[PDB]
Amino acid sequence: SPQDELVAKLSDEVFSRGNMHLKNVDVVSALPEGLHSFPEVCFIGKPNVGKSSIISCLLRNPRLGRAGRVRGTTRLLQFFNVGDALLLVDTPGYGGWKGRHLPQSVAERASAFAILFRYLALRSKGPLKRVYWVMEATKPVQPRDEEIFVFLRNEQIPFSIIISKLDYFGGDGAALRRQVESIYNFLGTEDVPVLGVRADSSRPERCINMTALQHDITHYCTTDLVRVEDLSYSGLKELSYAPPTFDEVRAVEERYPVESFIVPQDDNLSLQHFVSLHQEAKSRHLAASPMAMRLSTKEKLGANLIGETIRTINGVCIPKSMVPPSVVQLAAGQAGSFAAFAQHSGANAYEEFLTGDATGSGTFLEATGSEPREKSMRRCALDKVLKRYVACGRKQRSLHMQAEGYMCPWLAGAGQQARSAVFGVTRSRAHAGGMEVLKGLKRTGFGGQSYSARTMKNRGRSTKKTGFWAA
Amino acid sequence: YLRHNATWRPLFHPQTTGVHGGVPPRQQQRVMDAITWKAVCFRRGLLARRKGGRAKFGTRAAESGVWNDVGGITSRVVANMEQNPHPGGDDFGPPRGPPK
Amino acid sequence: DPVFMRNVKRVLASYKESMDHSSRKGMSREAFVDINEKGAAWYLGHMQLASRTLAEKVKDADFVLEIRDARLPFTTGNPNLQKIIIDRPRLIVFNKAEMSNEDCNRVIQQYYERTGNFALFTSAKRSWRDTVEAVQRFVTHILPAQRFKTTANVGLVVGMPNVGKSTLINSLRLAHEYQFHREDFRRPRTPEAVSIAPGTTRGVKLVPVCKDPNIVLYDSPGLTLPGCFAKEAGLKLAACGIIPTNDITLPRSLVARYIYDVLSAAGVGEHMAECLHLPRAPISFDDCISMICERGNLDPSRAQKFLIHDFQLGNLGRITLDKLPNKVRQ
Amino acid sequence: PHIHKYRELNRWQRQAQGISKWDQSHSHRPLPYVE
Amino acid sequence: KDPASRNIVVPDAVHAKVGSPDTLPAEILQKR
Amino acid sequence: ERNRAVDEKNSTRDPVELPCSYKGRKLKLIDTAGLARHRYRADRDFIGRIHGLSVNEIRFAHVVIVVFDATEGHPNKYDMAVLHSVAAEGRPFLLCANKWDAVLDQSATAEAIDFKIKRQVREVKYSNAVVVSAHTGLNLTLLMDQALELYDKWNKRVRRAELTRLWRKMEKSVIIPYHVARIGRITQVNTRPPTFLLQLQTKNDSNTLPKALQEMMKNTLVEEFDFRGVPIRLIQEVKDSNPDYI
Amino acid sequence: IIVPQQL
Ligand SMILES: Nc1nc2c(ncn2[C@@H]2O[C@H](COP(=O)(O)OP(=O)(O)OP(=O)(O)O)[C@@H](O)[C@H]2O)c(=O)[nH]1
Ligand SMILES: Nc1nc2c(ncn2[C@@H]2O[C@H](COP(=O)(O)OP(=O)(O)OP(=O)(O)O)[C@@H](O)[C@H]2O)c(=O)[nH]1
Ligand SMILES: [Mg+2]
Ligand SMILES: [Mg+2]
Ligand code: NA
After folding, report:
1. What's the CA-to-centroid distance between A312 and ligand 3, angstroms?
2. Pairing of strands C21-22, F129-131
3. Burial of residue C98, with CB atoms counted within 10 A of its CB: 0-12 exposed, 13-18 middle, 19 or more buried
4. Are C273 and C258 in contact, with CB atoms under 8 Å apart?
5. Closest Cα of chain A to F177: distance in Å?
6. Rounded CA gap, C155 and C157, in Å?
7. Is residue F116 a contact partner of residue A447, using CB atoms and an 8 Å limit?
8. Which residue ranges does the record assign to the G domain (chain C) (predicted)?
9. Do the Cβ atoms of A425 and F110 come closer than 8 Å?
10. How far is G3 from chain B (nearest CA, A)?
11. Is the dihedral of CA A79, A81, A85, A89 positive or negative?
């Protein structure tokens, strides 16, 4: 075929130049958008299905793509830049991580799933060119796979299916046909593309149908190109995308909160049964605990025991008692988010003031004695030195805001100009959206600051010019 | 109170104030010696608490095990780690299987 | 650990203190504290003193937005606006209308519609975004078209910070501040910043609500506040949960006596017993408290607390504690 | 003359802020560019 | 139907009269 | 072919002024040489001399049309720097995307140009772009029509009554985080470029308004009275002391 | 560890 031979020579030329690990993403703000805005391709699936093994086999390096028998090896989006023209996104496994005993397991898992689903829902229009749902060879359909398909059909994201563990069939064409038949029965579509391929980065001879995957991902990465000059290697490197707008990134974070990503330890109980077991066990504990009967129904509402509403991927509600406090501290700790900004500027000024006034000695009381000798000045001076120069304890600083927009939101300094600056064109009025296609951003950038957050070293309080205590 | 609010305290060599801060460096050396000593002692404790247990030895407790279990050289290899039925070689003793 | 019950036990073990009731405070903060652009402050004096400042702020504003409680409509509302005839139209928002009486809500709505100012009875579940949408509709369908497009319509928000005014103002301020704190590559890269000092209450003076309708809101911090209230007013506020229950001055015993009296004024004793799951209709307040204790190991203090919380949540029925004036009855 | 910025700061102010001696401006170490 | 949903009519006897001490603030009575 | 248009760089050296008439308006088309960065003309004195003649013509022109190659896509940093220099001199600026016939992805290019403009700091963000093909003559009348429209905005005059009524209702609509003095009266004292005088109620000289509030008022005047593509001057007059104070 | 001259 004319186009198939051109994309084949392109995929070979791009991948033959080498690759490297670009950036790991845990927060929605720190994304490769900027000078590193390549067309991206992600591989999602349940834990221990071969996602990182396929990445390591495509990248031709076993040590680069870290894979292991224990689940939970990948706990955040791993961006791999192949040939300086494409991005391969390695995603965390959606399911129960057995054998992984990392501290703060609930918070680390909730952060892993939050960045996963919010990245897919946001950049589905670009530069995420194709989503690959990696499923195990003979593993049946589980509620985790149901949650994935519900998320995809609600966001209207086209996805391809990769059946890994191809050696499990051992050349059984009949079993593979029944496996894809079970997939087509659960999905409900015959035209969904499915590619079965195993990956062994240790020995190249064990790999089968693996060179066809890099040709496939290049096909979906170049489908945006229109001209044959763009289909060339220079046209793909010039292809870049625009950053998301504030309105669409705020909507996806509101619909998909960090507290909603709480999955069971097993992979057989659905989210409905997992939240029902919490309700049943909590109702029994209240009716059995004597101190629980000492509380009032209004106090239980304040303690979120008897009881906006957090909806999961499937659309089921989770009570506030189900969310552990480690996750709440996680969302408020994530930099560049509304929760972290709300913690700094005050979540509830009237409520926080009365709370702080009650927990302290008083709003106007100073140097009071509750109903020995005080610390000497020579001690306070010594304690201040040990805190500042040894323990490295520092004070908080302020957060800045655009003055031109904060004073008046409906001016041109804030943006969102409905006018058309370009005159004499007919295609600009039709082309719109939060993320558009801009050619050559990798070499030109926006102008001034182009890298996103958490990209450069020694920024902000971590400057190496004046030392730590100077801040 | 009279030392900090009512006493004229001259400076030491105001020509080179931007170097020694107006304080005799012999007094500064005595002050720095005391602060550095107390800073090192507080640091040794903080480093031992961060790394766990002791600073140099870490979580390796003195009562549990040996500090350095490599005196001179140690051979990581283990004899017959493959657990093969016949480790004598490809051909050794009785012949295995019919010839040709 | 299949279900996170360790956290449930941890949060249930910490019930030693309630934020609604104070044990050794004779004065309340919810009656004097209100946040302004500089921070929180205590406003000492009745609203009849600041009537003139309120009138000036109303004249400066384009419309008025009152936030009242439907259970205590006239007790929560500012008497200065009732005494002074103002020309700026006002939209009133009555919260907890599902807890308030339906007949009284309808009569108040008819009275306000006949007067000319708009009334809106919202449920306790509706949100600040819903109130914002209501204000948008009001501005678009009531206020005339202005001459300058860059100019925006100003609305003076009047209410007590416990009914929802403070929550609405804080939500609007936080949203507007975050929108311009988060970086955006599409907007101009103006090298001007606005510092937000950490560890501050961060009160606001003016809050923009919308962009295309061009609506802004001015908050009046110390204009509407209960302050030094009367006996009946304090009983009503403590029964509706507006002010804390002081163990030294405003007792649970007195407020529960008031609730029992206002309920048993009419033939509602059997209905009160049915609501509280009582085996019989109570003859006296002490008998009712003892029956609530029996329904046991709990004390009469816990029984009074349960009765107060049931009346606050509305488990006793819909009731309007305020007396409707004759001009509203007409 | 001088072209640096910290020349208005004396040695005491430099050591108090925590700044390295600008007179010993070493360039054999490259800057941490985003490779 | 539901006892927690029915509305309760409050008579005019529980409402204290005008000019009553429990209706007027303590400052007015103190000053008088 | 009036001028010398070749494929080489640095072809034009002397400005060429041609008196013309468009729809009954006498105008002088001033073809100027290309501008260069300082890093290039530092080692080249002749290029620096040509640059001096180019920037000189900008200072005495009425309307300045900045032309850039649209085949590059988005305008260059130096192209945006020229627009800021034209706004600094006080001339209506207009961005022109030449060689539009040779553009392959006209959709992505028009968005890349629009993205650059709305990203600019000062009044340059209000500038308009016009796609133009010098070979095929692509809507050149539209280019001249806006050049005349920018001249009308340059000489545009605003009434003192509307300036005061606007600011009266604008103080109650904008948020002023700074501690500034009240603006008593605001009058347009001069035109081309339209200069506005802000009379402060204080008597101290160091009570000048911040740069954030100045750009806030300029954006207000532009979006209200349609001063788009035209710079605006602001002069702050402090209340003076009476000679006979008494 | 780095401690500046305090006095
Ligand atoms: N036989 C066979 N084993 C495989 C194949 N792919 C992966 N494995 C094995 O399965 C284990 C899981 O592989 P990973 O690459 O870590 O899978 P993962 O999805 O990245 O795991 P997580 O990061 O926890 O989500 C690996 O240690 C491999 O040994 C395959 O194609 N065939
Ligand atoms: N494809 C295409 N090429 C054009 C178009 N207009 C001009 N060119 C080419 O661009 C080149 C520019 O030549 P000039 O017009 O002299 O450019 P200039 O700005 O005057 O250059 P200097 O005087 O040296 O600063 C010409 O040689 C043309 O070949 C156009 O509309 N389409
Ligand atoms: Mg992995
Ligand atoms: Mg020329
Ligand atoms: Na030329």
Report:
1. 24
2. unpaired
3. middle
4. no
5. 8
6. 6
7. yes
8. 157-226
9. yes
10. 7
11. negative
